[PDB]
Structure 1
Amino acid sequence: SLVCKNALQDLSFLEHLLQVKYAPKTWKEQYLGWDLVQSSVSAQQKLRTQENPSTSFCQQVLADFIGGLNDFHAGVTFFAIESAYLPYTVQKSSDGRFYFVDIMTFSSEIRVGDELLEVDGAPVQDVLATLYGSNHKGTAAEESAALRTLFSRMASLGHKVPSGRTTLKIRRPFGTTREVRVKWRYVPEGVGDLATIAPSIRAPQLQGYNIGSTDGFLPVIGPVIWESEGLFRAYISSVTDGDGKSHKVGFLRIPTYSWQDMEDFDPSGPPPWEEFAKIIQVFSSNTEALIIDQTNNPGGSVLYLYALLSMLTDRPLELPKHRMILTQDEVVDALDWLTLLENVDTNVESRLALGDNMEGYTVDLQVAEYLKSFGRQVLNCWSKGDIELSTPIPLFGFEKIHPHPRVQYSKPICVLINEQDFSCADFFPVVLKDNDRALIVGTRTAGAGGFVFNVQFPNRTGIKTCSLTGSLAVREHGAFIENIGVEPHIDLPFTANDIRYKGYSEYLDKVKKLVCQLINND
């Protein structure tokens, strides 16, 4: 089959990429027991045993292949518009129950607070399992990612896309069970399937709960005495400990690290790191502690991550490093750095070459020194042959974060994290935890440790982008971040009660106690 031959040829290329620039390969083989060849043959078998397989089929098989790496940064997108979604958002309680927390439509028999029991006569947990990847380990993170695709399928991601209607068995809060008939919002495929066209081909002739949400879903922690009216959701409340003694506590939500994609961001007005700074000043002056909600964050720019970290300390913070796979491509970046900073010996000279700030991070002679150090280390590894999985190297050469020159929050911090924190959102709590700067609370993060790089190549299988991880992050003490993530100091999952009434009062009550203990420092 033409379609089949194309998929096998492209499968071998993706297989090849994994052997050239996939830094976590060795980790996956040892941690998951993953085997490139077997996994590859397992996919070839699915392609070869179909029957006039469709382009869609092949895309689905290739996505599962890359899906077997159990890597959030490793995936495959296709040139396919087909999709189907249901205007519902659910959240799972620590005791295994799924509740609707948001409905985006008309008074359907499904309301917020109802519990989801089945999908097409099958228990929700069993339907989710069919959405897991080949090497599913059972982490909360993989579970949640699967949940997110329960009501949002896209051919561009390799999902099977359903159409028509489906049955959801829901449970009302007063015990009434009802089977509800819902209809997928379906967008038909626009790219014609290559198999249908194959026989007619002629030889050439001449002549919110969303990840990244600004506000998040947590209700205020107590009476508000102050509130920011800018980009970020931030405010001051008064919490009374178990001794009727009031305390002023700051609350701030860091929604994403790709600052330009922030809801309501205006490229003409002042950058987001400047408004963040205005909020910290207020907090430094009028608060005794700071709660930072970092849940449901996709990550984004590292330099921005560093920018925010630099305003939450008055002492340098040690940073993790990355084991990299080097090619002459990285070597040229190294040389570019060294020449750009060649004649830099003063703070003024640093800014003249790098700018006043790098996405919020203050530029100094120290920044220029780190970057030069970075280029020298890349060049040294290259000449030493340490290029398959390099000695750990810090991004941009930054060994540590130095306190911002003007604003520095120095009181106790309590960061809230969850299974939907990836990339920089993994790093934020890692840095604060390992440097003992803050109390980490919530549930283990996703474990997406390594920078991504995308690869595009012409093909007739519909592959648009294959993204891969080019590094393996390692913490001060040796622990890898990939797949493990960051464990919180206090495991605090959401209960059925927190979710069922959308009050999260048991979660917030817990958070308030911890903070009070931080203040009273007992």
Structure 2
Amino acid sequence: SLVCKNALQDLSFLEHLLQVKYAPKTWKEQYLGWDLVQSSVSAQQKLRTQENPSTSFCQQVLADFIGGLNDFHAGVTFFAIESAYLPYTVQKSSDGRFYFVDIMTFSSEIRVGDELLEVDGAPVQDVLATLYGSNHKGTAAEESAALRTLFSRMASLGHKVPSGRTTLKIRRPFGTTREVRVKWRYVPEGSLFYSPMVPHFWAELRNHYATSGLKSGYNIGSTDGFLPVIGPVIWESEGLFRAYISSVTDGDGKSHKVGFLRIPTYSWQDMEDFDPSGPPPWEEFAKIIQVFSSNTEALIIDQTNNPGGSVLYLYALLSMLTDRPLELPKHRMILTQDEVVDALDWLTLLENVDTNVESRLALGDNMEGYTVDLQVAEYLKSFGRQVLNCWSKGDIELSTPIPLFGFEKIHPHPRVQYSKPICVLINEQDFACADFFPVVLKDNDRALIVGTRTAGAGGFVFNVQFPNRTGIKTCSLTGSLAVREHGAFIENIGVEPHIDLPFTANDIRYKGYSEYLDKVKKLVCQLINNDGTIILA
């Protein structure tokens, strides 16, 4: 077949792209087993083997390949439009049940709180396994994604787009069984530092959301969470974010002013309702804090469902969530004939900068939120050098561990800091930066991370666009890995919550998240008292 050749062709490219630009290679070779070569063969197999190959099909074939590294940072995208979609949304319960947390608004026999059992005579569980990846590992983070795409399919990512009528065995809340038939909203097919850390995933997902109804607060990076109010609101903010203050009462009857606040995405420009010319979402963040700095005892931060974003804006917000410097880890990275270039600009930009003024003069008054400061210009210099320290050494294959940009540690916003207790909320759908957050805090003991394990560590991604004959718009590959002592940072990929805590079916059933919250408030309260939550009760 003509396609198969071209398929095979563009495949050998991807193969090469893994060896040249995929930092976590060496790593991945251990934990998972994944052996690029013998995986590349399975590719051919599937290709030559198939009857007259479909273009789309080969795309899938390819997608699978990369999507097997089991790295959310890496995968492929194709110039495609074809796509399926059902106006529903679900969440899996602790024990293991599936409830309809939201129906868009097309008013159908289906309503909220309904347990989903089977699709076309197939128990959800099985219907989902089909959606899993190659080296599926049975983790929460994954089970989610699957579900995530259950009712939203994109050819753009190689998903096998369906269409037509379908069954939906939903069990009412009474213990009674019903079966519905619905139609898929189908669509016919017609630098290296400065790259936002986010999974490819989103890029198209984000575009998909806006494009088709689904605007719900259950989707990644929603300005508003999906967690109802934590009690009687005493203060709120009619701003860009979703913030308020409420009075919580412990196990005695003594009131406390607790502060809610949900960072949704770290790629700020993309914040729902953001107006460019006006003030930056980080200047207004500072405000929500200066109002907590004095009118609040504790701070709950919902960071669930965050995609990732700009490493520096993330760095910027921490800057104002602590009165003391925080410890930043190092990353092994890969460097090409252009990150080198990028550094040659840092160095020559602020080569003769001694004063704390010249510092802000050159680099501006702030870098995406974080404040300028000779200390910073001094970080970039030390950065710009290190890049070239690992350039001419025959080690581009994982440069010595280096701190993102010159930054070794965070520095307290010379203007606003939150000296009081903080508790962060996280779950299976927090990526790239969304990890760097709970982690950095938790590695300095500044927060009390609760909820389920993250989605997986961060690192600059490589957005490689290359000429091909198979629709590959782009291929994004992870270009940096976090190190430890002197290395090998893993055995999971995930910041673990101090307090493991899933969503109990009782929470989900009526969108009340009653129990989840209670346990939170408690924890907050034990903190309110002094510091250090003794036991889980």
The TM tier, using the shorter chain, reads: over 0.9
Residues 29 and 254 of structure 1: is their aligned pair in 2 closer, same or farther, counting only changes over 3 Å?
same
- In structure 1, what is the Cα distance between the partners aligned to 2:489 and 2:440? 13
Report deviation, 1:27.
Answer: 1.2
Does structure 2 conserve the Cα–Cα contact (< 8 Å) formed by 1:447 and 1:482?
A: no
Does structure 2 conserve the Cα–Cα contact (< 8 Å) formed by 1:316 and 1:403?
A: yes
Report deviation, 1:32.
Answer: 0.2
Residues 404 and 171 of structure 1: is their aligned pair in 2 closer, same or farther, counting only changes over 3 Å?
same
In structure 2, the residue matched to 1:379 is 388
Q: CA RMSD in A?
A: 5.4
- In structure 2, what is the Cα distance between the partners aligned to 1:402 and 1:180? 56
Does structure 2 conserve the Cα–Cα contact (< 8 Å) formed by 1:370 and 1:398?
A: yes
Residues 479 and 401 of structure 1: is their aligned pair in 2 closer, same or farther, counting only changes over 3 Å?
farther
Does structure 1 conserve the Cα–Cα contact (< 8 Å) formed by 2:21 and 2:462?
A: no
Does structure 2 conserve the Cα–Cα contact (< 8 Å) formed by 1:442 and 1:492?
A: yes
Residues 248 and 204 of structure 1: is their aligned pair in 2 closer, same or farther, counting only changes over 3 Å?
closer
Matches within 5 A, 1:220-259: 220-259=229-268
- In structure 2, what is the Cα distance between the partners aligned to 1:69 and 1:176? 43
Residues 206 and 371 of structure 1: is their aligned pair in 2 closer, same or farther, counting only changes over 3 Å?
closer
- In structure 2, what is the Cα distance between the partners aligned to 1:226 and 1:207? 24
SS at match of 1:487: coil
SS at match of 2:382: helix
Deviations 1:327-375 (A, max 9, x none): 2322222211111111111111112211111111100101100000001
Deviations 1:114-170 (A, max 9, x none): 011111111101111111111111111011011111000111100000011111111
- In structure 2, what is the Cα distance between the partners aligned to 1:147 and 1:480? 29
In structure 2, the residue matched to 1:197 is none
Report deviation, 1:326.
Answer: 2.1
- In structure 1, what is the Cα distance between the partners aligned to 2:298 and 2:233? 15
Residues 314 and 168 of structure 1: is their aligned pair in 2 closer, same or farther, counting only changes over 3 Å?
same
Report deviation, 1:109.
Answer: 1.5
Contiguous gaps of at least 5 residues in structure 2: 191-209, 532-537
Higher mean C-alpha displacement, 109-118 vs 329-338? 329-338
Higher mean C-alpha displacement, 13-22 vs 107-116? 107-116
Does structure 2 conserve the Cα–Cα contact (< 8 Å) formed by 1:98 and 1:116?
A: yes
- In structure 1, what is the Cα distance between the partners aligned to 2:325 and 2:444? 9
- In structure 1, what is the Cα distance between the partners aligned to 2:285 and 2:150? 35
TM-score by length of 1: 0.95
Does structure 2 conserve the Cα–Cα contact (< 8 Å) formed by 1:289 and 1:519?
A: yes
- In structure 2, what is the Cα distance between the partners aligned to 1:218 and 1:205? 18
- In structure 1, what is the Cα distance between the partners aligned to 2:32 and 2:212? 46
Report deviation, 1:451.
Answer: 1.1
Does structure 2 conserve the Cα–Cα contact (< 8 Å) formed by 1:153 and 1:160?
A: yes
Does structure 2 conserve the Cα–Cα contact (< 8 Å) formed by 1:319 and 1:476?
A: no
Contiguous gaps of at least 5 residues in structure 1: 191-200
SS at match of 2:211: coil
- In structure 1, what is the Cα distance between the partners aligned to 2:212 and 2:256? 78
- In structure 2, what is the Cα distance between the partners aligned to 1:156 and 1:476? 40
Residues 477 and 490 of structure 1: is their aligned pair in 2 closer, same or farther, counting only changes over 3 Å?
farther
Residues 158 and 203 of structure 1: is their aligned pair in 2 closer, same or farther, counting only changes over 3 Å?
closer
TM-score by length of 2: 0.92
Residues 510 and 479 of structure 1: is their aligned pair in 2 closer, same or farther, counting only changes over 3 Å?
farther
Report deviation, 1:23.
Answer: 0.3
Deviations 1:356-409 (A, max 9, x none): 111111001011000000011111122333321121111111101000010000
Residues 123 and 378 of structure 1: is their aligned pair in 2 closer, same or farther, counting only changes over 3 Å?
same
- In structure 2, what is the Cα distance between the partners aligned to 1:215 and 1:203? 19
Matches within 5 A, 1:458-469: 458-469=467-478
Does structure 1 conserve the Cα–Cα contact (< 8 Å) formed by 2:308 and 2:434?
A: yes
- In structure 1, what is the Cα distance between the partners aligned to 2:308 and 2:87? 25
Matches within 5 A, 1:128-167: 128-167=128-167
Report deviation, 1:206.
Answer: 52
Report deviation, 1:248.
Answer: 0.6
Deviations 1:67-89 (A, max 9, x none): 11101010100011100100001
Residues 482 and 264 of structure 1: is their aligned pair in 2 closer, same or farther, counting only changes over 3 Å?
farther
Does structure 1 conserve the Cα–Cα contact (< 8 Å) formed by 2:301 and 2:424?
A: yes
Does structure 2 conserve the Cα–Cα contact (< 8 Å) formed by 1:79 and 1:463?
A: yes
Deviations 1:428-454 (A, max 9, x none): 001000001010000000114221111
Residues 481 and 183 of structure 1: is their aligned pair in 2 closer, same or farther, counting only changes over 3 Å?
farther
Residues 288 and 477 of structure 1: is their aligned pair in 2 closer, same or farther, counting only changes over 3 Å?
farther
Does structure 2 conserve the Cα–Cα contact (< 8 Å) formed by 1:449 and 1:482?
A: no
Does structure 1 conserve the Cα–Cα contact (< 8 Å) formed by 2:261 and 2:300?
A: yes
Residues 125 and 352 of structure 1: is their aligned pair in 2 closer, same or farther, counting only changes over 3 Å?
same
Residues 290 and 5 of structure 1: is their aligned pair in 2 closer, same or farther, counting only changes over 3 Å?
same
Deviations 1:156-194 (A, max 9, x none): 10000001111111110111211110100000111xxxx
Does structure 2 conserve the Cα–Cα contact (< 8 Å) formed by 1:71 and 1:448?
A: no
SS at match of 1:445: coil
- In structure 1, what is the Cα distance between the partners aligned to 2:97 and 2:273? 34
Report deviation, 1:480.
Answer: 2.7
Does structure 1 conserve the Cα–Cα contact (< 8 Å) formed by 2:332 and 2:483?
A: yes
Question: Runs ≥4 in structure 1, deviation > 3 angstroms?
Answer: 201-207, 475-479
Does structure 1 conserve the Cα–Cα contact (< 8 Å) formed by 2:104 and 2:213?
A: no
Report deviation, 1:483.
Answer: 4.8
Report deviation, 1:457.
Answer: 1.4
Does structure 2 conserve the Cα–Cα contact (< 8 Å) formed by 1:448 and 1:483?
A: no
Residues 476 and 243 of structure 1: is their aligned pair in 2 closer, same or farther, counting only changes over 3 Å?
farther
- Give the percent of matched residue pairs that are identical in Structure 1 and Structure 2: 98
